[PDB]
Amino acid sequence: DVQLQESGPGLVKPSQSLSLTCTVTGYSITNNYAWNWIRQFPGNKLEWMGYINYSGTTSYNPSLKSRISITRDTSKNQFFLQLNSVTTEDTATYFCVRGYDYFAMDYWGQGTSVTVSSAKTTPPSVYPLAPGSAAQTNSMVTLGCLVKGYFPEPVTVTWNSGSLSSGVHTFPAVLQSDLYTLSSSVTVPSSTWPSETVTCNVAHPASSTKVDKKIVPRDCG
Amino acid sequence: QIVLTQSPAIMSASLGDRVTMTCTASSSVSSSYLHWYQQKPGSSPKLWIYSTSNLASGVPARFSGSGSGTSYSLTISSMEAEDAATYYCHQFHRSLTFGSGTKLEIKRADAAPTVSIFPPSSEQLTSGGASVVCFLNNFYPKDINVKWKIDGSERQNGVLNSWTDQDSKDSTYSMSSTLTLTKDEYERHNSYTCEATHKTSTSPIVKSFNRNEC
Amino acid sequence: DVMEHPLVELGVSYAALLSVIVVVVEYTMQLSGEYLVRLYLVDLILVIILWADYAYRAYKSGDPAGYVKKTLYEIPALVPAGLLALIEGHLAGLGLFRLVRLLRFLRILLIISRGSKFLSAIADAADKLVPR
């Protein structure tokens, strides 16, 4: 059972070097085939970066030739990737992959997300989103929570500590100006809210932040 | 070094429909080096068809690959739910290059969006910010027009939209549209409206609130 | 007009030993290019020397054809090592890894074949010095 696993820092500063390690098990990288690094950008475009085959020879994507280096440590059955002077555009998910006959990529690592940014770790601000009910009414009610200004990804959003899981939509995050923002909406029966408490739980592991925000009906004062 | 252009870029098919997607190369590619991969959000791509027409081990018989030279295709005799994914072609000549991908979605009955608008929270205003949020949930198809009108006038600046991937259960789409303003900007106007025009009705869906009545 | 001068008999035998040394140097020494190319040139000259000798014994001994079919195990050794290296690289560059495997085996046969001729050389040398 051939298996590849990538490892290394998920964050890198612009101008610096990105380094990743691939540990292979179930097959020896000196036996045969090509051992590749393939990345996928945020928009999902795939790009082959280069490889080092069983004999140690390397082959690189011409657009990266002057910035990359792929090496290996046969005693540990691992191969490495080094990409110099990285920029914002090198943000992507990196995969270590085996190149079988005709370069068919038969075994892929699960991939590791690398973000290239100058931003510092920042916890999100969490705001409750409650209806102003100006001709609102209808069998269902939608509530939400805005999570903005955080870095890096990801954040985890749940409702009522997870007990409220149906009718939830947590949107993909977007970069506003080097910081991420997203919102999550939850739709519950009109009999549920505001009668019963509805709370958004937001966790941001990178900043060791955990916040709960109660959705309140435009306060009585 | 050749370029692989995949078409359609995005397509939807009803379960049971015949599905065909194409990989067109800028220059002739040897059939032994043309491979296809299937990828679903959250996971790595999987070898699906190799050397033009050879199905990978776990791949169901409904799939087939064909082609030669500068034109190849991947066909699904009968679309199944688990086939919804993005497919990529790949080739080698002087270097290794990937196609632009074809995202295959599930077609379902049209559904109008449920629209909700939300004024900035009192907590955010105290901090000096003012984000107005609008959710357009569970609609189909994904095509939709969303506009923000402040005191009646359309505004595009400060608007960011985010779409969820097609829902695994109901096959619908949902999106958020957020208008980010400073507290000062927000306080210069009264009416805030999010308007959505979708195939399901010639009449746009409009949700609004008046700031000075909050 | 068979140039079978003892100076040739000496060289043919001496080439069988050097041909084996070639494989050892290729395996042991981590030669790169310039020095690696020189190694393969030496090997090429050696294989040609041995190429002749073999074709010779072939012609006489019950004429060509017949002989070769009995001494096929001697063919693999007569393949220039630089030729296999050149081929392997070209095959790997094209991702023809299944073939790289077979080429690998052909290299094994080449080593065994030369080792076989190696032993014959020594045995023959022992005879010329201490006949028996």
Domains and CATH numbers, chain B: 1-108 (2.60.40.10), 109-211 (2.60.40.10)
Contact indicator for B133, B178 with CB cutoff of 8 Å: yes
Size of interface A-B (CB pairs under 8 A): 128
Nearest chain A residue (CA) to C85 = A55
Give this entry's resolution in angstroms.
1.9
Walk me through the domains of chain A, giving residue ranges and CATH numbers: 1-118 (2.60.40.10), 119-217 (2.60.40.10)
The strand pairing partners of B133, in sequence order, are B118, B178
Interchain proximity B44–A129, CB inside 8 Å: no
Structure tokens at B34: 């043309």
Query: Which residues of C touch chain A, with CB atoms under 8 Å apart?
Result: 88-89, 92-93, 95-98, 100-101
Rounded to whole angstroms, the Cα distance separating A190 from A217 reads 13
Chain B contact present for A129, CB below 8 A: yes
Using H for helix, E for strand and C for coil, what is the string for chain B? CCCEEEECCEEEECCCCCEEEEEEEEEEECHHHCEEEEECCCCCCEEEEECCCEECCCCCCCEEEEEEEEEEEEEECCCCHHHCEEEEEEEECCCEEECCCEEEEECCCCECCEEEEECCCHHHHHCCEEEEEEEEEEEECCCCEEEEEECCEEECCCEEEEECCCCCCCCCEEEEEEEEEEHHHHCCCCEEEEEEECCCCCCCEEEEEEHHHC
Residues of C with Cβ-Cβ distance to A101 under 8 angstroms: 95-98
Which phi-psi region, left, alpha or beta, contains residue A26 (left: φ > 0; alpha: ψ -120 to 50)? left
Residues B63 and B20 sit within 8 Å (Cβ to Cβ): no
Indicate the number of domains in chain C.
1
CATH at residue C90: 1.20.120.350
Which residue in chain C is spatially nearest to A51 when comparing CA positions? C93
Distances (CA, A) of B30 to A209, B4, B38, B92: 53, 13, 21, 8
**Mutation site, A5, A46, A170, interface B, largest B CB count within 10 A:** A46
Q: Among candidates A113, A127, A118, A90, which has minimal Cα distance to A178?
A: A118
For an interface test with A, the pick among B162, B165, B167, B179 (most A C-beta atoms closer than 10 Å) comes out as B162
User: Cβ of A46 and B45 within 8 Å?
Assistant: yes
Question: C97 and A57: CB-CB below 8 Å?
Answer: no
Residue contact B162–A172, C-beta within 8 A:
yes
Structure-determination technique? X-ray
Beta bridge partners of A201: A158, A212
Question: Residue C71's domain spans which residues?
Answer: 1-132
Residue labelled with tokens 């800028």 = B26
- Is-contact A171 A145, C-beta < 8 A? no
* Chain-chain contact of A103 with C101 (C-beta, under 8 angstroms): no
Interface of B with A in 133-152 (CB under 8 A): 133, 135, 137
CA distances, A118 to each of A16, A152, B145, C83 (Å) = 11, 11, 35, 52
Helix (H, G, I), strand (E, B) or coil at A153: coil
Q: In chain C, which residues have their Cβ closer than 8 Å to the Cβ of A57?
A: 89, 92
Point out the residue among A55, A57, A102 whose CB comes nearest to the CB of C95. A102
Looking from the CA of B79 toward its CB, the CA atoms found within 13 Å total 19
In chain A, which residues have their Cβ closer than 8 Å to the Cβ of B210? 134
Beta bridge partners of A34: A53, A99
CB C100 to CB A32 under 8 A? yes
A123 and B CB contact within 8 Å = no
